[PDB]
Amino acid sequence: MFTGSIVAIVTPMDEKGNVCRASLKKLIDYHVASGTSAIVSVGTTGEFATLNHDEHADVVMMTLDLADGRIPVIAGTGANATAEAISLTQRFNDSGIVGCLTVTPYYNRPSQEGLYQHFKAIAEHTDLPQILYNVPSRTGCDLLPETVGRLAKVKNIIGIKEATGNLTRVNQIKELVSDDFVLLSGDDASALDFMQLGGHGVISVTANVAARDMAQMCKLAAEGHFAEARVINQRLMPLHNKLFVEPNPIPVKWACKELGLVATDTLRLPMTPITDSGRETVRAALKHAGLL
Amino acid sequence: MFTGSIVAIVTPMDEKGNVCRASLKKLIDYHVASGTSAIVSVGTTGEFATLNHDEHADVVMMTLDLADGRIPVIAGTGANATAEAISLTQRFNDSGIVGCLTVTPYYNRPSQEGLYQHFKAIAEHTDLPQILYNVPSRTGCDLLPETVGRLAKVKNIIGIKEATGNLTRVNQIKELVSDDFVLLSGDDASALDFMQLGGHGVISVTANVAARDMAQMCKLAAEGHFAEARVINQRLMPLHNKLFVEPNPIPVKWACKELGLVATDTLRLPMTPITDSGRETVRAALKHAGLL
Amino acid sequence: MFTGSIVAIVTPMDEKGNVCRASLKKLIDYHVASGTSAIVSVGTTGEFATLNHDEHADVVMMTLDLADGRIPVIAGTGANATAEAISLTQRFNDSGIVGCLTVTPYYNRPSQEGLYQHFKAIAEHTDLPQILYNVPSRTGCDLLPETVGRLAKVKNIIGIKEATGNLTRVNQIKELVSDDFVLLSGDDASALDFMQLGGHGVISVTANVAARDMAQMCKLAAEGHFAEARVINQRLMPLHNKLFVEPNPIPVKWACKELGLVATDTLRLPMTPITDSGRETVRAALKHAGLL
Amino acid sequence: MFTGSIVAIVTPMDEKGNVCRASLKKLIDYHVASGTSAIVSVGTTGEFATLNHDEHADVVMMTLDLADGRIPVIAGTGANATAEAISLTQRFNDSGIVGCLTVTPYYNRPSQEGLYQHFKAIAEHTDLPQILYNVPSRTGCDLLPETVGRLAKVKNIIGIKEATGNLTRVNQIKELVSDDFVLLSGDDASALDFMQLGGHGVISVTANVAARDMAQMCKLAAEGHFAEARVINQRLMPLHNKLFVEPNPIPVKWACKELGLVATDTLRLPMTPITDSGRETVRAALKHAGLL
Numbered sequence A, B, C, D: 001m002f003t004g005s006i007v008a009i010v011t012p013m014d015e016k017g018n019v020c021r022a023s024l025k026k027l028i029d030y031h032v033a034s035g036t037s038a039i040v041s042v043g044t045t046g047e048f049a050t051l052n053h054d055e056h057a058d059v060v061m062m063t064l065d066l067a068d069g070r071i072p073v074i075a076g077t078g079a080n081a082t083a084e085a086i087s088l089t090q091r092f093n094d095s096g097i098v099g100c101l102t103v104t105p106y107y108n109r110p111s112q113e114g115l116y117q118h119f120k121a122i123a124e125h126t127d128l129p130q131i132l133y134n135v136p137s138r139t140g141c142d143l144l145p146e147t148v149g150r151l152a153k154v155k156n157i158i159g160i161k162e163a164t165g166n167l168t169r170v171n172q173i174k175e176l177v178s179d180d181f182v183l184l185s186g187d188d189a190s191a192l193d194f195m196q197l198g199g200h201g202v203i204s205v206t207a208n209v210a211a212r213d214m215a216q217m218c219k220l221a222a223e224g225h226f227a228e229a230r231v232i233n234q235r236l237m238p239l240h241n242k243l244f245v246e247p248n249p250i251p252v253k254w255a256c257k258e259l260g261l262v263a264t265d266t267l268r269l270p271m272t273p274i275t276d277s278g279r280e281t282v283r284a285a286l287k288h289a290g291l292l
């Protein structure tokens, strides 16, 4: 459902830039085998920006089909226009997905009242659970704790993916919401720290290529075994950093390809192929994690 | 026309959020009479995020129809997916627009090489002049002078709307491009400074309500009469700042309503109505400018 | 020694701006009674910048005398010139102080190698334990974890006061140093979070006026009772923030005066008296903490 | 003289870190012959942080003695304690200096009112012209245009060395002060831009090694010949940047040694010797400038 190691799964492509079913199946089977808790389909790492709404929906539905009830699937459903986010969410109503990951509007920099109205309107047009997603480095907007508090009062707003990397937010939000509101890290390099402070899991980029380690790290964290979890964290720390050596998901797609998890590392413009230097950096990080 | 005072025009809406032809007509007449150089249609200030492609195109064509050859129209054509930007541009080829204003991809944070490929691909598939648009505070990425220099070698790429407010960019770019490449400010509060450093004009929010003063300011600047231009700028400075007291174009639409230029100040979610405190601040700024 | 609630004690003054012995005695007795773990004398909150070296030394020695072995005393000994920091430290050698709090050089923005050489040289000219102090908002310099690691190899460099407010630093530093290196927060508003992550205590501004609450919060933290500690934290959160409503130690001196702990709230220029609005804000924070 | 190219001169040292009279003489002769407007003695670049008051005064008096009336000398007189700044200023009254350069207090982060009181008190107790110095990246505080406007009403406060690199400050300050208040850049890389916007000169690091080119650049700027000035600036731009590749004045002292202007590149801790990579970068910048 909404705890533990949740993968922000890549949308693997063929050389033409369209979804590769065989690759997607291999990834999903990998996550089932590895103990991943849930899959976020067509979030940021899944190239939401460069799929059209139909393509996006096809990937989500394919991912649900391939998961075949073995692993819960959360759909990316954000938009910077409220009407468009409502449309997208409505596509998944009564679909099998367990909830939605919905990003603060990007580019148009709404106020906190705007963010409140946007997410409230979206929640009102679905029965699905909603996970808010805050990532100001990408959006130009910052969904502050006070506003998360106001939104957490809406019945089906049930958690947040907090991708600021600002660890003070964990307890700021926790004090304004009920004990069942879920706090998930959106920042792999700080996620263990984030769980140590009270968070419930991570929506992870690193879990694409280190799924078993991430699941084990998160289990240990949930049980309060921080020192054991840190050892795993330290082995993964170069990936947590170097998967952003070039823009996400350029490095993680290459890593998936190098590990034999996907057929090609193709992306859509304006994402471009990994540089030679980037390959060498990511390769070293994979070697450090024991994956290669 | 790509120099002087260029208005980033509001998209006036009725109470249902649909484009108000009558209000738009009144704005376009105002710009023609007030000496505005050109109209940017469905830019940021025109709520490009919350119009769908069809609506966006309708507004541009309506603007061209109402302008009736009396003022040049530049279309907002940016996207964060290169295929989508190409597609949107094709809809305007042979429309009568004089050029396009194309923003760096937002949210996905491409590399400089990605930006280069993005804009090169867009330019390749049109004969329309392209004006690059850099606004890191909205997009999460920053198109740097080195990359602007690379792109300025593309025949069709003719200028940049530089909205960082970082005035060192003027001469960093100027020294890498030819004399005929246009440097336009996208930051009203620093625009006169930008012109004094060698910029050619401004793509302006303030121009929506102070069109004549903007046009005269930019002419005086182009002639080197900076002290005279500065007097105008000082009367407009509160508006340059307070049109962003709440997210653009919330204040400017309320200002246009208050002057009588549009029938309603309605916006689309996630933009929300101006607060009372914002009305007060904006009205005071209009009065400082001598407009009310 | 170097754990729990450590007060960054004010240097109380008379109306002429010189140390008030009676006030200092009242504070010290308060900290003994309250369970404060140690006193940092003439740190930042003690107005190190505006005492001359003789005055600084007189305050430290007076504080040691008044403490009368009841509470350990750590001297502020930082300087932005290495020779000057060595001179100051040498004043306290064989004095009774238990260690030194030594800030990264300010203003001159040395490199990390510079910071390494500065602190190594200082440590070499004393047998006293050294606590490094990182506060980039004040110094223009940031002592990174890697360099803290290099310094922690020097026998008498034994801990750090980490005043970035960046909670990721706790585990970054912890992984590079031995298990006996002390990690203390320098940021009251994040300090409980900092202890939750592995830190050992706080050098606190808030402890000047909430000494018993701070000591109890830190004891609960050390014992792993985070939820009980948070309740205390929440009552103190407005002070942790509002003691910086005007520049430290302007608010905390006023609060000390209002509580009857010191005779006057006088400071030395360029610190200036608290504003009326500041008094009202700090008063409300004191009322929230139950102290007034 | 408070206009044109003003050098922030190095304090040349022998291998023991004491001032080298012979090297200083050679620098002063160089500045006299190269048309530098004035010499700032024991500013930032002159290692004011690591000289004691007596040494600082000795260097200023030695500079005046060697200058022998042939070039004006401005003393660095700032401090972070207002009494200390007053005291240091008194040592120079009737010395033959033409003015003082006085930095905003560093480390203690005073309010704007504190800055106002600080500088007003210093100005009150001298008849020497005072030049305010704003450099937030070093001090932790930012003297804002509104406060500069307040201080410019003090008879003795005659200008500002604005080292933010934020070029919007030029005209924000200019509009609040009289026509005779001097605006000087303290950021070599943006200095020509600063002059083009209405600044009167530059207090320069680059001028230590490119005195003639700096002097001609600033004259051309003062005459309005910006394109001609820009040609010079483009040859100096790598030096403007690479003199800060390691902390100032590490690079510039090594550059002066490499040109033969000083006998040693020695600095005081916490400044440390230039790295090999830094030598390479700086030498390349000197060659681009045509100096080697």
Ligand SMILES: N[C@@H](CCCC[NH3+])C(=O)O
Binding pocket: A048, A049, A050, A051, A052, A053, A056, A079, A080, B079, B080, B081, B084, B107
């Ligand atoms: N590329 C546009 C539309 C994406 C459609 C959602 N899959 C944006 O990021 O909003």
Ligand SMILES: N[C@@H](CCCC[NH3+])C(=O)O
Binding pocket: A079, A080, A081, A084, A107, B048, B049, B050, B051, B052, B053, B056, B079, B080
């Ligand atoms: N709302 C989406 C699609 C808008 C279509 C362009 N008018 C975005 O900002 O990319």
Ligand SMILES: N[C@@H](CCCC[NH3+])C(=O)O
Binding pocket: C048, C049, C050, C051, C052, C053, C056, C079, C080, D079, D080, D081, D084, D107
């Ligand atoms: N005010 C100067 C000297 C202070 C002397 C130390 N108590 C500085 O902050 O370095």
Ligand SMILES: N[C@@H](CCCC[NH3+])C(=O)O
Binding pocket: C079, C080, C081, C084, C107, D048, D049, D050, D051, D052, D053, D056, D079, D080
């Ligand atoms: N090193 C101390 C005192 C220097 C005295 C002035 N030359 C500071 O930067 O304030």
Ligand SMILES: [K+]
Binding pocket: A151, A152, A153, A154, A155, A156, A157, A158
């Ligand atoms: K809820």
Ligand SMILES: [K+]
Binding pocket: B151, B152, B153, B154, B155, B156, B157, B158
């Ligand atoms: K071109």
Ligand SMILES: [K+]
Binding pocket: C151, C152, C153, C154, C155, C156, C157, C158
């Ligand atoms: K040690």
Ligand SMILES: [K+]
Binding pocket: D151, D152, D153, D154, D155, D156, D157, D158
């Ligand atoms: K004056």
